[PDB]
Amino acid sequence: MHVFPRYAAARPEQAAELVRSNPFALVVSAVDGVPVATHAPVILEGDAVEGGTLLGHMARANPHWRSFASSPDVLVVFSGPHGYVSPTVYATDPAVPAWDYAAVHATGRVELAEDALDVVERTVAALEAPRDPAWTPTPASRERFRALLPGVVAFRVRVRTEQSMFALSQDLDAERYARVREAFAADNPGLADLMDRSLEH
Contacts 24+ apart (CB under 8 A), 127-134: 127/23, 127/41, 127/43
Q: Whole-angstrom Cα distance, residue 75 to residue 37?
A: 9
Q: Whole-angstrom Cα distance, residue 100 to residue 85?
A: 7
Q: Which is nearer to its own copies, 45 or 84 (CB)?
A: 84
Q: State the Cα torsion 76-81-82-83 to the nearest 10°.
A: 160
Closest contact distance (angstroms) between CB of 173 and its own copies is 16
If one asks whether residue 150 binds its own copies (CB under 8 A), the answer comes out as no
Closest contact distance (angstroms) between CB of 161 and ligand HEM is 17
If one asks whether residue 98 binds ligand ONH (CB under 6 A), the answer comes out as yes
CB-based contact 110:73 (threshold 8 Å): yes
Selected from 135, 151, 175, 178, the binder of its own copies by CB under 8 A is 135
Q: Scanning residues 24 to 83, which ones bind ligand ONH (CB under 6 A)?
A: none
Q: Scanning residues 151 to 170, which ones bind ligand HEM (CB under 6 A)?
A: 151-152
If one asks whether residue 28 binds ligand HEM (CB under 6 A), the answer comes out as no
Q: Scanning residues 58 to 117, which ones bind its own copies (CB under 8 A)?
A: 59, 61-64, 71-75, 77, 79, 82, 84, 86-88, 93-97, 99, 101, 103, 105, 107
Q: In degrees, to the nearest 5, what angle opens at C-alpha 44 toward C-alphas 39 and 47?
A: 150
Amino acid at 196: D
Q: Whole-angstrom Cα distance, residue 39 to residue 22?
A: 12
Q: Scanning residues 117 to 136, which ones bind ligand HEM (CB under 6 A)?
A: 120, 123-124, 127
Binding site for ligand ONH (CB under 6 A): 96-98, 148
